[PDB]
Design a protein around this ligand. Sequence first.
Ligand code: SF4
Ligand SMILES: [Zn+2]
Ligand SMILES: [Zn+2]
Lengths: 98, 149, 714
Amino acid sequence: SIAMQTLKHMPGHTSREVLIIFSSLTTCDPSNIYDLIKTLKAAKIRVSVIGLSAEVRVCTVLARETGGTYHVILDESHYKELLTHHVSPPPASSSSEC
Amino acid sequence: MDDQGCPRCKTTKYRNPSLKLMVNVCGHTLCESCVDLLFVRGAGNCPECGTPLRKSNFRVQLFEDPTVDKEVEIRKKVLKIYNKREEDFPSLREYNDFLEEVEEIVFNLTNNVDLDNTKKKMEIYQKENKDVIQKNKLKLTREQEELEE
Amino acid sequence: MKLNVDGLLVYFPYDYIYPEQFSYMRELKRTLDAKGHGVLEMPSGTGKTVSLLALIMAYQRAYPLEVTKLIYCSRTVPEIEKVIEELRKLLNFYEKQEGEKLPFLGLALSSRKNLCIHPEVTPLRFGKDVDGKCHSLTASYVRAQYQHDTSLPHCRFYEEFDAHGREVPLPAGIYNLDDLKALGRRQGWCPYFLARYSILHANVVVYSYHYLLDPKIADLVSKELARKAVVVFDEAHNIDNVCIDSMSVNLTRRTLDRCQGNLETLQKTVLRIKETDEQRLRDEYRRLVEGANPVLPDEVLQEAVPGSIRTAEHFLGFLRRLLEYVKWRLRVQHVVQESPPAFLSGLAQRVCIQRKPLRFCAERLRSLLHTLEITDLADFSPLTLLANFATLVSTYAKGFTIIIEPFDDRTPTIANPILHFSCMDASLAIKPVFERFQSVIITSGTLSPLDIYPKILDFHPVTMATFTMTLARVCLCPMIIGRGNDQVAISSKFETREDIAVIRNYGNLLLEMSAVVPDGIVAFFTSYQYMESTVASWYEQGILENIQRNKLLFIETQDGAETSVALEKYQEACENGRGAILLSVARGKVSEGIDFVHHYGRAVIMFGVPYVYTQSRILKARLEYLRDQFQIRENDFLTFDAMRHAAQCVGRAIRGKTDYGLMVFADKRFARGDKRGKLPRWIQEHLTDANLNLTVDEGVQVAKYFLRQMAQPF
Ligand code: SF4
Ligand SMILES: [Zn+2]
Ligand SMILES: [Zn+2]
């Protein structure tokens, strides 16, 4: 929600992206996140979670529905590879506009 | 033992269930502490009904239903008659027709006058007592002994 | 995807099949070719249905005369719905391949309560109530009165069905239960009776066991029409228990009192009938002299003559006598008594009730009660249950036993004693299926080793093969934890149940496993009392609060409403990131009914080997009789009953679609060779000695690593 509040007023041309480095599998939230997923899809904010020591189901659906990618750390060397891969710009999909 | 109590003295049936029903020609609930009360005065008379009894007409039973008491006793007496085995009759219907007449006799004796039943039973006596009653009566002990083991 | 099976060519909808599927198909074709009953096990919850259905359809096409039809039975209607979905997909694929419709019909049967279109019976959900209301609406008396067309609510659907469906049968197609309800509404016919008639000409019929095992209702729809049909039972590893339940009848004091009240009402109704209409209803006596459904199977059932009970009053008196005998025999206070033949002999001697007249008691009850034009059978149902018991006891007691419990368990003194008539061997009741049908395939998942099943059920199997799931990735990584952080034995023995150290080890293991495992976890205990004791100990200690902080916790209770609400919230918790820890009992109906899939019950925890209490006397008869006959050791059967139950309650996570998941058994007993040997082959082969007896911490670490491995894509 904080990221969405800041990114809502961002220009349409730029690609709004979020990389959640998830460590604790639990997610205690005041409101259901499935509803927020709809707003994220409407706002075309790509969310690509990187889980740690857990294949979180809510984050899996978040990533695939919002267009981002989900990954889990095999080790520190693979963590380096994951973040270095995320460095590069992501391809623009149909929803993306220039 | 689940009965609330005797129609007159419902104290033992609450304190202890050891008392058992006593069957009578009246088909009429009674309890030993009340059997003493019947013995003291009348000596074989139902308290409310006043039905006479030859010698107290008392035998131990444990069926709360007086109708079942009378029916079971009457059936016990009737079984001494018409005890011929089924295989004695090759006819299919006759296997259970006579049993139908037997149970009709039982129901007749339970409520309706038993004079006709007694006359009929005399008629069946004169014929059955010669062979069938004696034979089945003797074979009852043999079959029971074999079945028990 | 056309597979060139050794026997023939078989179509298949999905793109690829694992080698275990090839093995399954070839073994199944071998059994069908031998035309002999057999048993086989396949791991996957889904996929086995499609492979089996495709092979059966191809075999039917190749040798239509060999197999008349397929009778595929499933545990529950919610489960059989998935089967009908699979069959619909397969039929659509085959129809697309062929390019035209073919004379193939497939349908599912279910209770009138589950499916019906009458608004009066719609609001009511209780099955006996639906049965009684439908019997009243469809009664021969109601039909005759409908012929008169008098002012009275008549169920038009059955009449229209009799008018039309009798003449025209449904051409072909696949109809789920819900879709069949819509079809019945559209055509003004019964979704139930229409399917019942289609059973005569249907290629595939699917219904639960209680539609095919209990002689009361099974026989009528499983008549000799299917002389040579492929009958298949799916996931029917708990077939012995259901087959026993189909025979066991429980008599209680409250039920007996209700029976007595119903009998009084019966007598009053008989008097009213005598004063109102006597001759027309007396014609029943003539047809009886000429000579709720009977519980006697095909050959055991007899219809020579009703017996000495030939009139309403005579039958009523007979029932009064038997009810009085049962009432007193139950009121007796004493130790548990067993008496299969002695009960019948004592009944006959004490109350003068001959076994032959007692045999036809239930059938004559059905006929006489029909004569009375009663409002419904729901009110008199207890009397019908008592009559079924009365006829069964006089029918046979060679492989049965009457148990009397003056005192119930869990109560030092209770005024509601219970008389059980639990069976001891399921072969007696399942004999008609094997004998009538040329071959029966008991396809099951999580099956405890097949060798026992022929001993319990008297049949000669053709094939005995165990199929192991093979995938490019190790979907399942089961483990057994017997040593805690204290290196102390963690067996959940009866004498070791009270051990606070063992309870603490279980709590700490659950805490760490919930900390590492992703959202969704289910833990199965051995009994409600044991689960409550462990939960209370954890509550007294701080472990439970830490578990609550780490993840949400839900618990199961005997009440079905609370169970359903808790499971409904558990599903939402699994969907969300909170996660959930569902504590349940292995014998709980929730464990058998529920199915765990991807992101549901990810890590299955088994706290203690599931063993039934060693005091329930019913199991004593069931077990010592098996020792005496068929020669099964008591310990052997007990361990088999534990391992089969554990496999049932732990095999859900591998449902289908290759969804990862780990099965952890927190009990050193599972590490024993006998338990491992009796464990299903597919789980055991994956299990290895390296992880056989991991400590709590080591198990947690390996679980974390395995979850890491499974997280990444293929
Ligand atoms: S006759 Fe058909 S429509 Fe009427 S209550 Fe019975 S099942 Fe329902
Ligand atoms: Zn008295
Ligand atoms: Zn009297």
